[PDB]
Design an enzyme around this catalytic site. Structure first.
Site, mmCIF file in Angstrom:
data_model
loop_
_atom_site.group_PDB
_atom_site.id
_atom_site.type_symbol
_atom_site.label_atom_id
_atom_site.label_comp_id
_atom_site.label_asym_id
_atom_site.label_seq_id
_atom_site.Cartn_x
_atom_site.Cartn_y
_atom_site.Cartn_z
ATOM 1 C CB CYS A 169 -0.974 -0.072 1.188
ATOM 2 S SG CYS A 169 -1.719 1.480 1.757
ATOM 3 C CB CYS A 176 0.300 2.116 3.938
ATOM 4 S SG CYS A 176 -1.377 1.431 3.766
#
Length: 104
Positions: free
Chosen positions: A29, A32
């Site tokens: 991700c 993230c």
């Protein structure tokens, strides 16, 4: 600095600290990755009054299911073991600060 939490120690951790910021994330991700260093800054700025913890959704699917975190990054703030604030998506440090100080 930020520690790792799992389905096994998630509850213990929340019960041992008054204010815990949990980051639900994954390696694949990108958003993230963008907030990781921001959360590290958050960890230091509030060192002593706040614990920053990371929950990898790939290794801990039951914990992600538990809070129905199906879009990451998702950060949840717990006060005395209870969830009190949620921040969905990659956000600037000030947004986390706002919600953290909102609980001292």
């Amino acid at each position: 600095k930020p520690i790792e939490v799992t389905d096994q120690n998630f509850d213990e951790t929340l019960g041992q600290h008054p204010l815990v910021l949990v980051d639900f994330w994954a390696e694949w991700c990108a958003p993230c990755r963008m907030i990781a260093p921001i959360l590290e800054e958050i960890a230091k700025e509030y060192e002593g009054k706040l614990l920053v913890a990371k929950l990898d959704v790939d290794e801990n699917p039951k914990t992600a299911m538990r809070y129905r975190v199906m879009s990451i990054p998702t950060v949840i703030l717990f006060k005395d073991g209870q969830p009190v604030e949620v921040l969905v998506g990659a956000q600037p440090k000030r947004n986390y600060q706002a919600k953290i100080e909102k609980h001292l």
